[PDB]
Amino acid sequence: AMEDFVRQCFNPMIVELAEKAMKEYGEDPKIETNKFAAICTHLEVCFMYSDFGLKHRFEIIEGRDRIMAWTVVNSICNTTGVEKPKFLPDLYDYKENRFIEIGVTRREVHIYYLEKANKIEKTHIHIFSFTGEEMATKADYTLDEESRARIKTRLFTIRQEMASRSLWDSFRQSE
Ligand SMILES: Cc1ccccc1-c1cc(=O)c(O)c(C(=O)O)[nH]1
Ligand SMILES: [Mn+2]
Ligand SMILES: [Mn+2]
């Protein structure tokens, strides 16, 4: 099952978190399996992205409960002066001094980019695909190629792990 794969291929903290997020909003990961597996993959991106960095470069926001998330956001704005987003972003960058929205899609990167841009308003956008493809505002990719390589590989690995289990097609088509 997809769900097996999720518990089998992701550190529990992440699976724990994905399960909390879904089940609090009345979604079953035993049913919404491809969503379970998508939420995990996003989180891991976000965590990875955060921890590739001025020792402490980024502020993780995705992962946190909504009290904490908006606390950290309200804290950041109140001291840096950067405008408050209408929707919770995944990261803030204390170096480039702006929020980031991390997208991960199984479709093309320019499509998911437009979707993202469309919804937001001054947040940096970065999209990763599972094909080692990415696209980011002003093509400002924000990270030393070194780091961006590691995500791309992980995502590709997750793609390819799904395909070992004949799970890719299901997943690819559920976005
Ligand atoms: C991962 C995911 C699955 C289904 C619907 C929305 C999302 C999602 C994607 C994001 O990139 C994201 O930043 C969030 C979010 O809750 O902040 N949710
Ligand atoms: Mn987010
Ligand atoms: Mn995101």
mmCIF file of C-alpha atoms and ligand atoms in Angstrom:
data_model
loop_
_atom_site.group_PDB
_atom_site.id
_atom_site.type_symbol
_atom_site.label_atom_id
_atom_site.label_comp_id
_atom_site.label_asym_id
_atom_site.label_seq_id
_atom_site.Cartn_x
_atom_site.Cartn_y
_atom_site.Cartn_z
ATOM 1 C CA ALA A 1 0.000 0.000 0.000
ATOM 2 C CA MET A 2 1.033 3.662 -0.391
ATOM 3 C CA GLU A 3 0.673 4.054 3.402
ATOM 4 C CA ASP A 4 3.152 1.237 4.049
ATOM 5 C CA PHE A 5 5.664 3.005 1.833
ATOM 6 C CA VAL A 6 5.180 6.288 3.793
ATOM 7 C CA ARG A 7 5.928 4.721 7.186
ATOM 8 C CA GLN A 8 8.673 2.667 5.496
ATOM 9 C CA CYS A 9 10.533 5.586 3.722
ATOM 10 C CA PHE A 10 10.120 8.685 6.074
ATOM 11 C CA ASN A 11 11.525 9.487 9.572
ATOM 12 C CA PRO A 12 8.631 9.140 12.096
ATOM 13 C CA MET A 13 8.641 12.774 13.292
ATOM 14 C CA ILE A 14 7.495 13.554 9.693
ATOM 15 C CA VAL A 15 4.944 10.707 9.535
ATOM 16 C CA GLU A 16 3.695 11.679 13.023
ATOM 17 C CA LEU A 17 3.308 15.280 11.775
ATOM 18 C CA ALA A 18 1.645 14.354 8.455
ATOM 19 C CA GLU A 19 -0.806 12.118 10.395
ATOM 20 C CA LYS A 20 -1.605 14.887 12.931
ATOM 21 C CA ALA A 21 -2.199 17.471 10.153
ATOM 22 C CA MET A 22 -4.574 15.214 8.173
ATOM 23 C CA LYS A 23 -6.541 13.645 11.039
ATOM 24 C CA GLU A 24 -7.122 16.991 12.812
ATOM 25 C CA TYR A 25 -8.843 18.273 9.604
ATOM 26 C CA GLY A 26 -10.939 15.070 9.226
ATOM 27 C CA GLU A 27 -8.797 13.263 6.574
ATOM 28 C CA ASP A 28 -7.793 9.561 6.846
ATOM 29 C CA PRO A 29 -4.201 8.747 5.709
ATOM 30 C CA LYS A 30 -5.380 5.112 5.369
ATOM 31 C CA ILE A 31 -7.678 6.431 2.592
ATOM 32 C CA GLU A 32 -6.066 9.652 1.304
ATOM 33 C CA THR A 33 -2.832 7.742 0.865
ATOM 34 C CA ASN A 34 -1.320 9.779 -2.012
ATOM 35 C CA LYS A 35 -2.003 12.954 0.038
ATOM 36 C CA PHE A 36 -0.372 11.400 3.107
ATOM 37 C CA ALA A 37 2.661 10.693 0.909
ATOM 38 C CA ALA A 38 2.595 14.175 -0.653
ATOM 39 C CA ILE A 39 2.439 15.936 2.762
ATOM 40 C CA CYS A 40 5.379 13.940 4.046
ATOM 41 C CA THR A 41 7.438 14.758 0.937
ATOM 42 C CA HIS A 42 6.725 18.504 1.253
ATOM 43 C CA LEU A 43 7.634 18.507 4.970
ATOM 44 C CA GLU A 44 10.955 16.729 4.265
ATOM 45 C CA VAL A 45 11.773 19.218 1.504
ATOM 46 C CA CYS A 46 10.980 22.021 3.937
ATOM 47 C CA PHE A 47 13.034 20.550 6.768
ATOM 48 C CA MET A 48 15.918 19.721 4.464
ATOM 49 C CA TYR A 49 15.775 23.272 2.949
ATOM 50 C CA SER A 50 15.763 24.829 6.476
ATOM 51 C CA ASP A 51 18.794 22.857 7.724
ATOM 52 C CA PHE A 52 21.117 23.725 4.737
ATOM 53 C CA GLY A 53 22.075 26.960 6.530
ATOM 54 C CA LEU A 54 25.212 33.171 9.464
ATOM 55 C CA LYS A 55 24.886 29.693 11.070
ATOM 56 C CA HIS A 56 21.039 29.786 11.567
ATOM 57 C CA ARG A 57 19.846 31.048 8.133
ATOM 58 C CA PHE A 58 16.201 29.916 7.834
ATOM 59 C CA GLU A 59 13.152 29.794 10.058
ATOM 60 C CA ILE A 60 11.049 26.628 9.645
ATOM 61 C CA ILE A 61 7.309 27.472 9.689
ATOM 62 C CA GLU A 62 5.756 24.425 8.021
ATOM 63 C CA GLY A 63 5.644 21.742 10.696
ATOM 64 C CA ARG A 64 4.398 24.066 13.473
ATOM 65 C CA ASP A 65 0.801 24.227 14.838
ATOM 66 C CA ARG A 66 -1.048 27.355 13.703
ATOM 67 C CA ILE A 67 -0.553 29.216 17.017
ATOM 68 C CA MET A 68 3.209 28.775 16.801
ATOM 69 C CA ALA A 69 3.417 29.440 13.027
ATOM 70 C CA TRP A 70 1.693 32.838 13.225
ATOM 71 C CA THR A 71 3.670 33.657 16.437
ATOM 72 C CA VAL A 72 6.955 33.163 14.550
ATOM 73 C CA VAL A 73 5.591 35.119 11.567
ATOM 74 C CA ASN A 74 4.385 37.987 13.833
ATOM 75 C CA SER A 75 7.735 37.867 15.643
ATOM 76 C CA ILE A 76 9.705 38.056 12.350
ATOM 77 C CA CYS A 77 7.674 40.993 10.945
ATOM 78 C CA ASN A 78 7.739 42.947 14.230
ATOM 79 C CA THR A 79 11.601 42.949 14.267
ATOM 80 C CA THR A 80 12.644 42.853 10.512
ATOM 81 C CA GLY A 81 9.752 45.029 9.236
ATOM 82 C CA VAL A 82 8.921 42.643 6.317
ATOM 83 C CA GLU A 83 5.202 42.605 5.429
ATOM 84 C CA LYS A 84 2.890 39.876 6.879
ATOM 85 C CA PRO A 85 1.732 37.170 4.388
ATOM 86 C CA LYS A 86 -2.017 36.413 3.982
ATOM 87 C CA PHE A 87 -1.150 32.701 3.955
ATOM 88 C CA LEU A 88 1.438 30.952 6.171
ATOM 89 C CA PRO A 89 4.679 30.365 4.178
ATOM 90 C CA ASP A 90 7.104 27.430 4.737
ATOM 91 C CA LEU A 91 10.297 29.405 5.466
ATOM 92 C CA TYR A 92 11.818 32.812 6.170
ATOM 93 C CA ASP A 93 15.331 33.701 4.938
ATOM 94 C CA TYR A 94 17.260 35.869 7.514
ATOM 95 C CA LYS A 95 20.023 36.434 4.875
ATOM 96 C CA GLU A 96 18.010 37.498 1.760
ATOM 97 C CA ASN A 97 15.463 38.814 4.324
ATOM 98 C CA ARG A 98 12.154 37.501 2.859
ATOM 99 C CA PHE A 99 9.682 34.557 3.261
ATOM 100 C CA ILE A 100 9.814 31.476 1.029
ATOM 101 C CA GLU A 101 6.986 29.317 -0.342
ATOM 102 C CA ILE A 102 8.277 25.875 -1.230
ATOM 103 C CA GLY A 103 6.327 23.997 -3.849
ATOM 104 C CA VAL A 104 6.758 20.322 -4.811
ATOM 105 C CA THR A 105 4.806 19.073 -7.893
ATOM 106 C CA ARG A 106 4.615 15.919 -10.065
ATOM 107 C CA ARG A 107 3.570 18.198 -12.983
ATOM 108 C CA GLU A 108 5.748 20.788 -14.761
ATOM 109 C CA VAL A 109 7.444 23.372 -12.557
ATOM 110 C CA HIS A 110 6.176 26.495 -14.447
ATOM 111 C CA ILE A 111 2.550 25.335 -14.011
ATOM 112 C CA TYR A 112 2.849 24.716 -10.300
ATOM 113 C CA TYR A 113 4.765 28.029 -10.098
ATOM 114 C CA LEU A 114 1.881 29.997 -11.661
ATOM 115 C CA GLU A 115 -0.637 28.247 -9.352
ATOM 116 C CA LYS A 116 1.471 29.257 -6.404
ATOM 117 C CA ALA A 117 2.110 32.849 -7.568
ATOM 118 C CA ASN A 118 -1.592 33.216 -8.418
ATOM 119 C CA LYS A 119 -2.736 32.375 -4.861
ATOM 120 C CA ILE A 120 -0.355 34.622 -2.925
ATOM 121 C CA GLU A 121 2.096 38.553 -2.224
ATOM 122 C CA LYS A 122 5.859 39.425 -1.795
ATOM 123 C CA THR A 123 6.968 35.893 -0.793
ATOM 124 C CA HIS A 124 9.803 34.210 -2.636
ATOM 125 C CA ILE A 125 8.684 31.113 -4.555
ATOM 126 C CA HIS A 126 10.752 27.962 -5.160
ATOM 127 C CA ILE A 127 9.338 24.902 -6.941
ATOM 128 C CA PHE A 128 10.944 21.453 -7.010
ATOM 129 C CA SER A 129 9.732 18.627 -9.256
ATOM 130 C CA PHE A 130 10.570 14.897 -8.925
ATOM 131 C CA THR A 131 12.465 15.092 -12.252
ATOM 132 C CA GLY A 132 15.331 17.233 -10.819
ATOM 133 C CA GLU A 133 13.662 20.378 -12.219
ATOM 134 C CA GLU A 134 13.158 23.646 -10.341
ATOM 135 C CA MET A 135 11.998 27.229 -10.916
ATOM 136 C CA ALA A 136 12.099 30.187 -8.475
ATOM 137 C CA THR A 137 11.185 33.944 -8.527
ATOM 138 C CA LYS A 138 13.775 35.983 -10.581
ATOM 139 C CA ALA A 139 15.455 32.551 -10.930
ATOM 140 C CA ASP A 140 16.885 33.335 -7.480
ATOM 141 C CA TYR A 141 17.402 29.749 -6.361
ATOM 142 C CA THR A 142 18.417 30.930 -2.823
ATOM 143 C CA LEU A 143 20.830 27.925 -2.093
ATOM 144 C CA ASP A 144 24.344 26.811 -3.090
ATOM 145 C CA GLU A 145 23.917 24.232 -5.868
ATOM 146 C CA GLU A 146 25.427 21.661 -3.374
ATOM 147 C CA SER A 147 22.261 21.771 -1.225
ATOM 148 C CA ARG A 148 19.708 22.077 -4.053
ATOM 149 C CA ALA A 149 21.319 18.894 -5.434
ATOM 150 C CA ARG A 150 20.465 16.966 -2.256
ATOM 151 C CA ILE A 151 16.746 17.817 -2.406
ATOM 152 C CA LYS A 152 16.480 17.000 -6.141
ATOM 153 C CA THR A 153 18.105 13.582 -5.486
ATOM 154 C CA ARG A 154 15.848 12.819 -2.435
ATOM 155 C CA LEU A 155 12.705 13.730 -4.378
ATOM 156 C CA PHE A 156 13.937 11.647 -7.380
ATOM 157 C CA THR A 157 14.656 8.834 -4.886
ATOM 158 C CA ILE A 158 11.103 9.123 -3.429
ATOM 159 C CA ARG A 159 9.768 9.129 -7.004
ATOM 160 C CA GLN A 160 11.788 6.045 -7.876
ATOM 161 C CA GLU A 161 10.971 4.261 -4.582
ATOM 162 C CA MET A 162 7.270 4.691 -5.396
ATOM 163 C CA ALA A 163 7.900 3.261 -8.878
ATOM 164 C CA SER A 164 9.593 0.126 -7.370
ATOM 165 C CA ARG A 165 6.221 -0.468 -5.694
ATOM 166 C CA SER A 166 4.178 0.402 -8.852
ATOM 167 C CA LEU A 167 2.896 3.456 -6.896
ATOM 168 C CA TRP A 168 4.261 6.276 -9.093
ATOM 169 C CA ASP A 169 1.369 6.379 -11.628
ATOM 170 C CA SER A 170 -1.254 6.614 -8.887
ATOM 171 C CA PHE A 171 0.710 9.404 -7.211
ATOM 172 C CA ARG A 172 1.778 11.310 -10.345
ATOM 173 C CA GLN A 173 -1.855 11.711 -11.414
ATOM 174 C CA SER A 174 -3.235 12.879 -8.031
ATOM 175 C CA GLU A 175 -2.217 16.582 -8.232
HETATM 176 C C1 LIG B 1 1.118 19.389 0.752
HETATM 177 C C2 LIG B 1 -0.181 19.805 0.451
HETATM 178 C C3 LIG B 1 -1.096 18.832 0.061
HETATM 179 C C4 LIG B 1 -2.412 19.146 -0.272
HETATM 180 C C5 LIG B 1 -2.828 20.470 -0.204
HETATM 181 C C6 LIG B 1 -1.918 21.455 0.203
HETATM 182 C C7 LIG B 1 -0.597 21.133 0.526
HETATM 183 C C8 LIG B 1 0.286 22.144 0.911
HETATM 184 C C9 LIG B 1 1.359 22.483 0.074
HETATM 185 C C10 LIG B 1 2.264 23.479 0.432
HETATM 186 O O1 LIG B 1 3.191 23.721 -0.354
HETATM 187 C C11 LIG B 1 2.073 24.152 1.668
HETATM 188 O O2 LIG B 1 2.969 25.130 2.033
HETATM 189 C C12 LIG B 1 0.991 23.833 2.531
HETATM 190 C C13 LIG B 1 0.746 24.464 3.765
HETATM 191 O O3 LIG B 1 -0.151 24.056 4.557
HETATM 192 O O4 LIG B 1 1.427 25.453 4.101
HETATM 193 N N1 LIG B 1 0.098 22.821 2.129
HETATM 194 MN MN MN B 2 3.494 26.016 3.979
HETATM 195 MN MN MN B 3 4.889 24.788 0.381
#
